[PDB]
Structure formats: structure tokens, C-alpha cells
Amino acid sequence: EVKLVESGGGLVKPGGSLKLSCAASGFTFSRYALSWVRQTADKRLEWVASIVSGGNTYYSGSVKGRFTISRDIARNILYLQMSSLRSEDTAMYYCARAYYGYVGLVHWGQGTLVTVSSAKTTPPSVYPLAPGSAAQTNSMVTLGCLVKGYFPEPVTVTWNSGSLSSGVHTFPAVLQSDLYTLSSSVTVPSSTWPSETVTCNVAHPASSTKVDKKIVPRDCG
């Protein structure tokens, strides 16, 4: 099986440097042309650089002179050295293998995220989202969790450690002035809450933060 896996992404200050890795497996590493493609927030795709079996390397205008793509044939790892990182470089970086020759980009990995900014890493604040009393009760009830003031992306949210997975809607984070905010909602039978516990689990790798917030019905004395 062909498999390519990116790693190395993270938060970096402008002008800084970062080296990305892409572990290859399931094929003759030096036989194929390997490429780096990035995807910006507007989901647009931009070819970054490629290295063919010949060793020859190529770059995109914006990259030229700042990035360097290389490979360690022995360890079966593709690299992307970055420097003079500009805000414009913030994006999800994927590595892919040509299908053959200069034809097609296949087996892209899950990608690694590169955030270039001056803002400092900030732990998320996790707030529980409880309804309005009880009067407005049908068979279902919707609860939620607000995760705001963290940086950088990403953060993960699960419900009941993952036990609760159906009826969930997690919204893409929005950046408002150097800080992200995200929310997740979950709908459960009104008869099971708050009888049984409903808790959202939020993890923020960048800050090694991990928080579990139980959703408790509003005060109401």
C-alpha cells in the first residue's frame, strides 16, 4: 500500500524557518517524483515544489529562494525546508507521489498545518451550553460547548469521550483578532439529560491543554 504521512507543521513567527517531513512507504522512494502542495483557508490549492527521481527540484514563484525540497532516499523521507516564512505561507501542507512520470498527484497524506503569525499560543476557554430551563421540552434537547480564545488551530472536541457521536455538529473555527472560537452542538433525548451525564472533551495540542466540561442545566436555584 502506498502511504505518505506529513509531520512538522506548527506555529512559527514571520521570517522564521520550519522543516516539514513526509514519511513514504509502500514503494520505491527514489523512483517517483514527489511533491508538496498547500491549501490555504480559501481552500485554494497551490503547487509548492517537486523533486523528480532525477533529483531535479522545482518551486513556485512565491516559494523560490525561500523553500528547499529534498529527500533522504535511505530513510524514505521527503522534506520541505522553509525560511523567511511570510504570513502568506499559512496553510495545510500535503505531500503527494506522482502516479508515474509527471502524471497525477496521488496518495496525498492527511497533511500538516503551518501557521505563520506573531500571536502567541493561547489555551482555549471551554464554556458549557445549557438550554432555557425545561419549559420548551419536546422529545429531544440540544446542548453545546463553546471553545474560544485559543490559538493556533487545531482543537478537537468529542462528547462523552466519544461515546456520544451521533447528533453532533462541530463548527469550523473562526479567527477573530488573533484568537479562534469554535462551537459544537449535540442533540439527545430530553429524557436522558440531565439524568445521564453529557460532557464535551476539548483538546488543544499546541498548549497541551485538555478539558472536559460537563453540561449542567441552568442554575434556576
Binding site: W47, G101, V103, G132, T142, F171
Partner: protein, 219 residues
């Protein structure tokens, strides 16, 4: 540096119907060893992009025959015979005629389904956040279609424009609906200076806005 223009930006299609996506290159395609360096990719929600068609009309193994590619000189088209729910996602054409190879701006194929109004829920700020001086009122609008929707926040009756943060999920393949989140952020001082809080949702499905609200002084 060539320029690849993709059309349209969004393509709503009914299941069973045909999908047509096109790409024009600001320059005649430069054949490679004869074939044309034209390729199409599909990136499904939360997944990495994948190859569908290459050489302009060649089907990468595993891709259903429902997918076909055609075209010539700057003009190229991706066609999906009978769209299935799972086809949902963003398509991209790729023109690697010269360095640097280029991607079209993408086309979000959207599954057309019966209009459905959103199930709206409003949540007041949490104790914990108030204790910190912040105050965010949240409104969830779930499982609706079409995606176009208007959400107005009213505090004690007046429309609030500043301090809102909206976010939509991609289209769910299970039911073809979209869900949205609207967050109104304020200061604790202000939140306690008013009484009523409401999010009004105007959706094609009704000239009557769906309204949800609560009074800061209640249960």
C-alpha cells in the same frame, strides 16, 4: 505562469442528475509526450484531495465510470453522469502544462434536496464565562437547506451588528443539510444591562423569521 479559470463556483445538482464542471486555461495547453496534462481532483469534506481523471480523460483506477473527462485547447470539462450523494465535495481541475502546474479555484458540488427549515436553539452566556467578564450568546441553526440564511441578533429589540461570529459546516452526505452557528460576544457589563436576547433566522422556507430568545433575568 498560466491561469486556470474554473466554473462555476458552486454546482447544486439533484441526485440522479448530471453534473458539469469546466476549466479554461488562459493559454493553450502544452501537450506532454502527446497527451494533454489535464487532471481532475475531488476533495471530500475532511479528506485529502484525490485523483479522478488525468491525461484529460483517463480514469484513475477505482473511480466510477460515472466520472468522465473531456475537452481541448484551454477548454476542459468534468462530467458526472448521475450524481450520487457521496460525490459531494470540492472538485479541482489541474493544468500541469508548464512550471508551475496550476489548480483551478475549485467547484463545490452541492447536493440539491427538499428545502428544510433550521431547528434553532439559543443559549445564554455560561456562569463560568460571566465570572471572567465575557458574555457570549450562542444560537445553533441545524439541518437546513438551502444554505443561504439570514441571522439577526436583537438585544431588547434592537439589531446588533458588531461582535457576531458565524460558521457553517460543510454539507452533510447523510442528509444533504447544512448546519450553522452564530455567536454574539459582549461584555459582562452590557449583557447585564439588557433583558431580552434573540436570534432571528430568515430562511427561504418562510417569510416568517424563526425566532428564539430568552430573558437574562430568568430560568
Amino acid at each position: 505562469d498560466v491561469v486556470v479559470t474554473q466554473t462555476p463556483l458552486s454546482l447544486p445538482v439533484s441526485l440522479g442528475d448530471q453534473a458539469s464542471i469546466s476549466c479554461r486555461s488562459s493559454e493553450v495547453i502544452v501537450t506532454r509526450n502527446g497527451y494533454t496534462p489535464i487532471e481532475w481532483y475531488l476533495q471530500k469534506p475532511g479528506q485529502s484531495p484525490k485523483l479522478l481523471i488525468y491525461k484529460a480523460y483517463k480514469r484513475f483506477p477505482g473511480v466510477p465510470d460515472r466520472f468522465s473527462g473531456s475537452g481541448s485547447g484551454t477548454d476542459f470539462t468534468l462530467k458526472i453522469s448521475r450524481v450520487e450523494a457521496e460525490d459531494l465535495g470540492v472538485y479541482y481541475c489541474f493544468d500541469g502544462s508548464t512550471v508551475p502546474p496550476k489548480f483551478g479555484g475549485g467547484t463545490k458540488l452541492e447536493i440539491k434536496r427538499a428545502d428544510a427549515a433550521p431547528t434553532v436553539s439559543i443559549f445564554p452566556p455560561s456562569s463560568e464565562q460571566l465570572t471572567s467578564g465575557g458574555a457570549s450568546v450562542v444560537c445553533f441553526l441545524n439541518n437546513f437547506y438551502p444554505k443561504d440564511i439570514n441571522v439577526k441578533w436583537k438585544i431588547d429589540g434592537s439589531e446588533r451588528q458588531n461582535g457576531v461570529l458565524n460558521s457553517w459546516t460543510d454539507q452533510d452526505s447523510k442528509d444533504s443539510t447544512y448546519s450553522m452557528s452564530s455567536t454574539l460576544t459582549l461584555t459582562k457589563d452590557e449583557y447585564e444591562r439588557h433583558n431580552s436576547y434573540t436570534c432571528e433566522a430568515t430562511h427561504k422556507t418562510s417569510t416568517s423569521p424563526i425566532v428564539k430568545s430568552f430573558n437574562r433575568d430568568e430560568c
